[PDB]
A paper describes a structure:
In the CU pathway, a dedicated chaperone facilitates the folding of pilus subunits in the periplasm and an integral outer membrane (OM) protein termed the usher provides the assembly platform and secretion channel for the pilus fiber. Periplasmic chaperone–subunit complexes are then recruited to the OM usher (PapC for P pili, FimD for type 1 pili) for subunit assembly into pili and secretion of the pilus fiber to the cell surface. Ushers contain five domains: a central 24-stranded ß-barrel domain that inserts into the OM to form the secretion channel, an internal plug domain that forms the channel gate, a periplasmic N-terminal domain (NTD) that functions in subunit recruitment, and two tandem periplasmic C-terminal domains (CTD1 and CTD2) that function in pilus assembly and secretion. Using cryo-electron microscopy (EM), we determined structures of the activated PapC usher in the process of secreting two- and three-subunit P pilus assembly intermediates.
To generate a two-subunit intermediate, we replaced the PapK NTE with the NTE from PapF (PapKF-NTE) and deleted papE and papF, resulting in a ∆EF P pilus tip fiber composed only of PapK bound to PapG. In the ∆EF cryo-EM structures (Conformers II and III), the PapF subunit is not present and instead PapK is directly engaged in DSE (by its engineered PapF NTE) with the pilin domain of PapG. The lectin domain of PapG in Conformers II and III has not yet fully transited through the usher channel and the PapG pilin domain is still located on the periplasmic side of the usher. In the Conformer III ∆EF structure, PapC CTD2 undergoes another dramatic shift, moving 28 Å toward the N-terminal end of the first lobe of PapD, next to where the usher NTD is bound, forming a PapC NTD–PapD–PapC CTD2 interface. The usher’s other periplasmic domains also undergo conformational changes in Conformer III compared to Conformer II. The PapC NTD moves significantly away from the plug domain, shifting laterally by ~21 Å. The movements of PapC NTD and CTD2 cause the bound PapDK to move laterally, leading to a slight upward movement of the PapG adhesin. In Conformer III, CTD2 also makes direct contact with the N-terminal tail region of the NTD: CTD2 residues P744, F745, and W781 interact with NTD residues L8 and I16 in a hydrophobic network. Comparison of ∆EF Conformer III with the PapCDG crystal structure reveals significant additional changes that likely reflect requirements for the expulsion of the plug domain and activation of the usher. (5) CTD2 then shifts toward the N-terminal end of the first lobe of PapD, forming an NTD–chaperone-CTD2 interface, which is accompanied by a counter movement of the NTD and bound chaperone–subunit complex toward the CTDs (Conformer III).
Residue numbers in the entry:
A (entry chain G): 21 to 336
B (entry chain C): 1 to 644, 647 to 808
C (entry chain K): 22 to 178
D (entry chain D): 1 to 215
Write the structure that this text describes.
């Protein structure tokens, strides 16, 4: 006969990496747990209650299995990278969404155990068995948005028992019956994105003082702004309308500075509003945004002007 | 220069310094602050030391000459002149005026009315520098000390079966740099303890995960490396080892020398003269060679029309329209790249050793846009030879391929030999956005053994995971309506005598707005893993609409019969820098159970260290409340400090005495000792450290703010701040006879500092006076008198002062 | 993601016209013919002063003209001249109507003689040097160089 | 000539020193200039409240010149409930020629100063000129000033044809003062004055015989 019942742990853990930049990658501890197990399987074909007066077969192995691909807050596919398997034995290369490693430490033992061989799942036992630890890392994706994310980890941690009648019974347990079981063992990651595209100033101070009227008519005053990143991608931006213009001028983004003065802006020579550029390497550029100081259609009513606008950057 | 001495509102006719200062106004031999500008740019935005003295070198009959800038040696050595080529300033002292008798064509116009110093000179006498392409002079790398940065989390918990709450994370990367040699060792630890009714167990763990030291070289543009690390997957996979490594660093080179744009291949007749203008400014005017020419020296920023005007030798001209897209390639001809790594292999344990190797990996590009790459990994019992080329054909895309001849002689006497070929293919930016960014094809056999496979089969003896042959492609295409970048995909695998598990993944990204603002991004994906009998159809769903301080978030996901739901309102605060995450969720599992979770969070970016809090509570897992501590510190430098998490570079702003000054960059405030440190900076850039001038408190003031320096990775830059207060007072200077001296005479200090001048009734309002010194008044071309200001004087007082001669 | 704004201000450039830069009028008269004989006078010199503006509906309500200078001690209403004639001559300045021999420090009555030529306000005048009676009868006037420059306070209203 | 951009020099209580650029209109010869600040009783206060730092500087043909104006605790000891009017004066020094009997023209210009304290500070779009109440004596309109600032008017007329074209003498006042100005009786007085910008806001009154204000 071959009666096999399973043991599943009751541990929930915490862990934290902190704040990592998108160009960098993290590493993480996958600690082995010698916790309290709970029975989640009740099968019996041979004897019901344990007697242990005949030297029957026994072995005890561990069982930790993890899925190869999960999801995040916005549903992104989290590619779990395997870094170092430890001193264990990873098998089943024909799978694509589950890892399969086992550890044979207790084997070919003759049994002399009394009691009950096949019991109910509502039972817990104290077992202290520490083993080899595993250390990993993760190949995270490139295109990630900003904000804070809470990554939930679905896993299992535990293994199986064995009671046969003879020495030399290499029994194997299928994986579909193992993966169809419910999930209880711990989930815990929290992360906030730093980002890889951050401009230079982010305070946007543009200033110009007093002058005459005739010089001011169709005058120009410039201001430069740079931005630096290190990932090759196609970056765009958008200029938001804050104020309102008096006259109609069409394609020209004229910002109303008050008193009948709609100063047209200069996106490095032309009033186009927004453009599109690409990055093939790392680095930075420079981008001088000025504006033409003509805002009144010759019925000149000048005053103290402090009109505003808002330009932000859109990720690809 | 002669002026009118009579026309002035003064009751006293003593104007000997009134004609003199007016006449002396060509070059004034005094001490002011000027900004030295060389050929348009500036070497110093806040140059304080600018000295002027009358030259008595050149003797004459009249001795009426022009004084120049009496420069010292620091500002002439920080400007970047090639001092070994032309030695005309290395022999000049600070006592006399630096004369320019040895070199031609450079003129100097010192104007103290504009606060500038213009120098116009040719490029053949000096080197080149800007915000990009810093000179090879060493920067501020002094007293590195130690660098700590902790990231720890303390939290509570409770399960369905009772409760237990003691959970602690323990990580950080400490290490001490010593000059150019810089060290960092990252520790790994934790603290767990559980308290049930019948059992009280706990465990503690700590280990030295990774300890490492490094030093960079600017002469050969390579970074040396000693210790344990991993190599990225170019051809071979990733693997652990211990030892030496010579790797890449291409931060120093300029983008004109790095990138090269394709030029005009027009061949008209001879050695012509090109003229290219953008807005009415010639960016390039030189003599091209005879016949065919190609200018790859110009890779600047263009955003428009550029009229390529050619001036031939006979006088012929031709105008044609060139685009703004000048299509720069990723291949780099003339530059090589290399990996010279050696040492021992690292297993899984901390003291796990192995065999000794010697590996050489290099790549070389020829200048016909073709590029080869060869690798020679050589160990004591395992050898693999790699070679291969890559080239862009232009209009059909680009290709690259390589062969890897590997021999493997294991300890169990089994020699395996194989030559495997892998080819990579891609595609340029097409018209209808046809973009194959990668297309691989890896040919293998059952007789293979990689280095990781050699180390696992040699000691752990596993004889599995054999791959036969496969193909992949990566196509992505957008359309100019509905904002959708279609990326339909297919990837296929197969092992040796193990099944396929062929994949099928598709995608569609909608972007629009109905009854709301634009910014709603809807990206949708669906995946399928095809086995012989099983096809797992997974798909992700979401609803995300932002409104700035509010964002309704939802998340749907179903791998295999397990649909999960989420609901949230996560966004920032009104300042935009503070944040909180708030979301609920619904979980439906396949095993007849419906689960629910509710998680709350709030963060706070304090300048000493970043802190946050979290609330997590789900079904069967209860009351997991947390708190986090993360930040950084630097001890045994100039002064100890506390900051928020670094990734390799930090600059040290020194504002002594003031505890509350806000600086820019990351808005860090200082301490009671008066020291500060910024974090968000990068290597080899123009770093303008200015304080928040309008956010100053009313106890302190600021004289000047802009200081300039360029830092590298792992160095700490010290920045001294000369901001001090100045007392202002009205002093009535009286002579020895009783009479008043002729007003209009300027007062110089003891350290060479001009402050102001004497008014009509022998009075002199002066600001910035230090109490205790002995001042100097100057008229008729020399020093005339001295007065001794007492230490009991404070600002805004009326003091009668007696004159004593020197 | 920040406020793109520019705080500006401006002002009206109230000024004088630059056409009257060459106002070096001279007195090429003889001091022993026109200043020794008892007609004690030189031939008068005329000068018009332009001042550009934006609006000229008012003249004296924007800038008020008043003149001053080193007054002659032995001559009321006349100024002291420098040079070889130390207090021997007196400059008599006529107004825009050319009748009133006003004082160095009193102002001209506005409303008359102010040429409103568009935005430029023309102002013609007349001035001649009179002889001081302490040196006219005794004929002690030294024939030579005599430099004179009077201030003009153009007070803005 | 010499370009003068300021219409009225207005100083605020928050700022300790303001700035002013003056430039050259002549392109044929360089120049020199000297300045001073006077007061209400018209004397050269060289130990005044505000001290202009450069006394004399050389001006090139067509170039510009700067001047900074430092301030002393006497402004603080003075009452901040009202403004402090002053008169700064400019004088240029031209290069003396060598010809005989040269009548060079010396130019002197006066333009007004205005220190406003921070306790009675004015917002950038604040108009207090509509707060002014005007009464009428038989033969002249008397002006009542409840404002803590200096007021200045240059025009009055029943229509706009007699507002900027009608003859009216310049009448200034002091803070919280009152006086009687001789003027004819008008149904709708068109108060055309010069504001802080320098323009002409023609505030058309709504009067009640001897009670004139704005709605």
């Amino acid at each position: 006969w071959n009666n096999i019942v399973f043991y599943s742990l009751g541990d929930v853990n915490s862990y934290q990496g902190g704040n990592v930049v998108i160009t960098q990658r993290p590493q993480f501890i996958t600690s082995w747990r010698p916790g309290i197990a709970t029975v989640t399987w009740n099968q019996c074909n041979g004897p019901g209650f344990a007697d242990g007066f005949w030297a029957y077969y026994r072995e005890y192995i561990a069982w930790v299995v993890f899925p190869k691909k999960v999801m995040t807050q916005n549903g992104y596919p989290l590619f779990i990278e395997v870094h170092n398997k430890g001193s264990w034995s990873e098998e089943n290369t024909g799978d694509n969404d589950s890892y399969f490693f086992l550890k044979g430490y207790k084997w070919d033992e003759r049994a002399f155990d009394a009691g009950n061989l096949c019991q109910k799942p509502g039972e817990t036992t104290r077992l202290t068995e520490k083993f080899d630890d595993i250390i990993f890392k993760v190949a995270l994706p490139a295109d990630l948005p900003l904000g804070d994310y809470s990554v939930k980890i679905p896993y299992t941690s535990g293994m199986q028992r064995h009671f046969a009648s003879y020495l030399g019974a290499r029994f194997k347990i299928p994986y579909n019956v193992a993966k169809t079981l419910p999930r209880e063992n711990e989930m815990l990651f929290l992360f906030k994105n730093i980002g890889g595209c951050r401009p230079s100033a982010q305070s946007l101070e543009i200033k110009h003082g007093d002058l005459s009227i005739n010089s001011a008519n169709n005058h120009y005053a410039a201001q430069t702004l740079s931005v630096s990143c290190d990932v090759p991608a196609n970056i765009r931006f958008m200029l938001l309308r804050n104020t309102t213009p008096t006259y109609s001028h069409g394609k020209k983004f004229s910002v109303g500075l008050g008193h009948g003065w709609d100063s047209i802006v200069s996106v490095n020579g032309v009033d186009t509003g927004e453009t599109t550029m690409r990055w093939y390497k790392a680095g930075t550029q420079n981008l001088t945004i000025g504006s033409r100081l003509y805002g009144e259609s010759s019925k000149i009513q000048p005053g103290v002007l402090s009109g505003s606008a808002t330009l932000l950057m859109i990720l690809p | 220069v002669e002026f009118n001495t009579d026309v002035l509102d003064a009751a006293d006719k003593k104007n000997i310094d009134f004609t003199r200062f007016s006449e002396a106004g060509y070059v004034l031999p005094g001490q002011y602050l000027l900004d030295v500008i060389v050929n348009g740019q500036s070497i110093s935005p806040a140059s304080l030391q600018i000295s002027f003295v009358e030259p008595q070198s050149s003797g004459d009959k009249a001795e009426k000459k022009l004084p120049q800038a009496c420069l010292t040696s620091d500002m002439v050595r920080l400007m970047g002149l090639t001092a070994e080529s032309l030695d005309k300033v290395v022999y000049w002292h600070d006592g006399q005026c630096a004369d320019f008798h040895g070199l031609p064509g450079v003129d100097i116009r010192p104007d103290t009315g504009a606060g500038v110093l213009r120098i116009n000179m040719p490029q053949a006498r000096l080197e080149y520098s800007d915000a990009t392409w810093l000179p090879p002079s060493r920067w501020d790398d002094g007293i590195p000390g130690l660098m700590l940065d902790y990231n720890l989390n303390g939290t509570v918990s409770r399960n369905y079966q009772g409760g237990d709450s003691h959970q602690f994370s323990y990580n950080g990367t400490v290490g001490g740099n010593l000059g150019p040699w810089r060290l960092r060792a990252d520790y790994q630890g934790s603290q767990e303890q559980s308290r049930y009714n019948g059992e009280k167990t706990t465990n503690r763990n700590f280990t030295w995960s990774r300890f490492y030291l490094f030093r960079a070289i600017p002469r050969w543009r390579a970074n040396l490396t000693l210790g344990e690390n991993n190599i990225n997957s170019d051809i071979f996979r990733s693997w652990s080892y211990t030892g030496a490594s010579l790797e890449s660093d291409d931060r120093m080179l300029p983008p004109r020398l790095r990138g090269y744009a394709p030029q005009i291949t027009g061949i008209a007749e001879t050695n012509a003269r090109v003229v290219v203008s953008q807005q009415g400014r010639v960016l390039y005017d030189s003599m091209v060679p005879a016949g065919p020419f190609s200018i790859q020296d110009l890779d600047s920023s263009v955003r428009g029309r550029l009229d390529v005007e050619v001036i031939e030798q006979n006088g012929r001209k031709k105008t044609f329209q060139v685009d703004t897209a000048s299509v720069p390639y990723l291949t780099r001809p003339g530059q090589v790249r290399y990996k010279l790594v050696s040492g021992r292999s690292r297993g899984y344990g901390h003291e796990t050793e192995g065999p000794v190797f010697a590996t050489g990996e290099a790549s070389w590009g020829l200048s016909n846009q073709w590029s080869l790459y060869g690798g020679a990994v050589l160990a004591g019992d395992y050898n693999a030879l790699a070679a291969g080329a890559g080239w862009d054909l232009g209009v059909p895309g680009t290709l690259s391929a390589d062969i890897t001849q590997s021999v493997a002689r294991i300890e169990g006497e089994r020699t395996f030999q194989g030559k495997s070929w892998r080819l990579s293919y891609s595609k340029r930016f097409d018209n209808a956005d046809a973009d194959i960014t990668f297309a691989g094809y890896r040919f293998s056999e059952r007789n293979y053994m990689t280095m990781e496979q050699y180390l696992n089969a040699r000691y752990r003896n596993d004889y599995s995971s054999r791959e036969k042959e496969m193909y992949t492609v990566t196509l992505n295409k957008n359309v100019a309506d509905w904002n959708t970048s279609f990326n339909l995909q297919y990837s296929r695998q197969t092992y040796w005598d193990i099944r396929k598990t062929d994949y099928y993944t598709v995608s569609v990204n909608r972007y629009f707005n109905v009854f709301g603002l634009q910014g709603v991004a809807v990206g949708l994906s669906a995946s399928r893993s095809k086995y012989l009998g099983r096809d797992n159809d997974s798909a992700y769903l979401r609803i995300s609409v932002p409104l700035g301080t509010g964002t309704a978030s939802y998340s749907g996901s179903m791998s295999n019969d397990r649909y999960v739901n989420m609901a949230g309102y996560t966004d920032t605060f009104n300042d935009g820098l503070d944040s909180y995450s708030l979301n609920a969720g619904l979980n439906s599992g396949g095993g007849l159970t419906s689960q629910r979770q509710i998680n709350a969070y709030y963060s706070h970016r304090s300048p000493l260290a970043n802190l946050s809090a979290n609330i997590a509570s789900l079904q069967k897992g209860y009351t997991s409340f947390g708190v986090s501590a993360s930040g950084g510190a630097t001890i045994t430098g100039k002064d100890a400090a506390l900051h928020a998490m670094s990734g390799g570079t930090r600059l040290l702003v020194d504002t002594d005495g003031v505890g509350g000054v806000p600086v820019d960059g990351g808005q860090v405030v200082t301490n009671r000792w008066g020291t500060g440190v910024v974090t968000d900076i990068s290597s080899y850039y123009r770093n303008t450290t200015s304080v928040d001038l309008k956010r100053l408190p009313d106890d302190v003031e600021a004289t000047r703010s802009v200081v300039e320096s360029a830092l590298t990775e792992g160095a700490i830059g010290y920045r001294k701040f000369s901001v001090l207060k100045g007392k202002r007072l009205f002093a009535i200077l009286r002579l020895a006879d009783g009479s008043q001296p002729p007003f209009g005479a300027s007062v110089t200090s003891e350290k060479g500092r001009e402050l102001g001048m004497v008014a009509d009734e022998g009075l002199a309002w002066l600001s910035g006076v230090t109490p205790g010194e002995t001042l100097s008044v100057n008229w008729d071309g020399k020093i005339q008198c001295q007065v001794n200001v007492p230490e009991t004087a404070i600002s805004d007082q009326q003091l009668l002062l007696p004159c004593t001669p020197q | 993601s920040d406020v793109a704004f520019r705080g500006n201000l401006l002002d009206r450039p109230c000024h004088v016209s630059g056409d009257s830069l060459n106002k070096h009028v001279v007195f090429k008269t003889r001091a022993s013919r026109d200043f020794w004989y008892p007609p004690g006078r030189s031939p008068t010199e005329s000068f018009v002063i332009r001042l550009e503006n934006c609006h000229a509906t008012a003249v004296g309500k924007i800038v008020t003209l008043t003149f001053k200078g080193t007054e002659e001690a032995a001559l009321p209403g006349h100024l002291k001249v420098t040079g070889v004639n130390a207090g021997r001559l007196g400059i008599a300045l006529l107004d825009t109507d050319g009748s009133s021999l006003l004082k160095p420090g009193t102002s001209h009555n506005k409303g008359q003689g102010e040429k409103v030529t568009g935005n430029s306000l023309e102002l013609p005048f007349g001035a001649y040097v009179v002889a001081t009676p302490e040196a006219l009868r005794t004929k002690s006037v030294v024939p030579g160089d005599y430099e004179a420059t009077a201030t003009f306070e153009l007070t803005y209203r | 000539a010499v370009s003068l951009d300021r219409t009225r020099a207005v100083f605020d209580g928050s700022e300790k020193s303001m700035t002013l650029d003056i430039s050259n209109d002549n392109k044929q010869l360089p120049y020199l200039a000297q300045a001073w600040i006077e007061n209400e009783n018209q004397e050269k206060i060289i130990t005044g409240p505000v001290i202009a730092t450069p006394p004399v500087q050389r001006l090139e043909p067509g170039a510009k010149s700067m001047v900074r104006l430092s301030t002393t605790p006497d402004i603080s000891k003075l009452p901040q409930d009202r403004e402090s009017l002053f008169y700064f004066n400019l004088r240029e020094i031209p290069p003396r020629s060598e010809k005989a009997n040269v009548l060079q023209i010396a130019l002197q210009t006066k333009i007004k100063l205005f220190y406003r304290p921070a306790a009675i500070k004015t917002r950038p779009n604040e108009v207090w000129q509509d707060q002014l109440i005007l009464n009428k004596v038989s033969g002249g309109y008397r002006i009542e000033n409840p404002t803590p600032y200096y007021v200045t008017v240059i025009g009055l007329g029943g229509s706009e044809k007699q507002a900027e074209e009608g003859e009216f003498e310049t009448v200034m006042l002091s803070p919280r003062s009152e006086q009687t100005v001789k003027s004819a009786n008008y149904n709708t007085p068109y108060l055309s004055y010069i504001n802080d910008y320098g323009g002409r806001p023609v505030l058309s009154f709504i009067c009640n015989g001897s009670r004139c204000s704005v709605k």
